[PDB]
Structures are given as structure tokens and as C-alpha cells.
Amino acid sequence: SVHLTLKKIQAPKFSIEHDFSPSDTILQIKQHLISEEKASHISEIKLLLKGKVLHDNLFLSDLKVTPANSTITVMI
């Protein structure tokens, strides 16, 4: 599985951890975020990794994540 940190720095801040499938897509991350009540709609959520925009149809398997680089930037 892929274990990610979902971190938003702008107030109101949060830093949450969750496991996903490499067969999950970025949408599933946005879906998880909605389910955690971090935003009113999946369309409100921008996901970033090192400044690069993670589009909805990107499979997690297409990302190389590591313990110090397993943090997705969340922008609402």
C-alpha cells in the first residue's frame, strides 16, 4: 500500500495520515479528504507534491513516495 501524509499549511491547518492502494487515483485522496470534512466538494481540492499538480486520473502507482517524501500538499 501507499501511506501518505495529507498536509495543509494555510489556516485552518491539518496534517492527516492515511493508507491507499497503488490502484487508487488522486480522486480517491480528494474523496478521503471530503469524507474527513476538509472541504465542501472534491472540486475545491488541489493536490501537490513538490509543487507539481496531481491530476484526478493519476494512479498512485505513478508516484515515487518515500518516508521523507510521502507528504502531499493540500490546497483548498
Side-chain angles (χ1 to χ4, degrees), residues 12-68:
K13 310 167 52 179
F14 65 80
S15 192
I16 66 195
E17 263 152 275
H18 201 70
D19 276 47
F20 300 83
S21 162
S23 291
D24 274 327
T25 74
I26 304 299
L27 186 58
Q28 279 60 77
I29 299 174
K30 297 191 180 174
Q31 281 165 1
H32 181 254
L33 281 174
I34 291 306
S35 169
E36 289 303 271
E37 283 165 334
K38 298 311 192 183
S40 66
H41 199 294
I42 61 171
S43 71
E44 297 283 335
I45 304 164
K46 188 70 145 291
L47 296 181
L48 299 173
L49 178 47
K50 307 308 183 310
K52 201 211 80 174
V53 179
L54 306 174
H55 69 274
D56 290 331
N57 290 306
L58 184 79
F59 282 99
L60 289 220
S61 73
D62 302 331
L63 288 171
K64 172 55 178 318
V65 350
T66 50

Side-chain angles (χ1 to χ4, degrees), residues 65-71:
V65 350
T66 50
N69 296 263
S70 56
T71 296

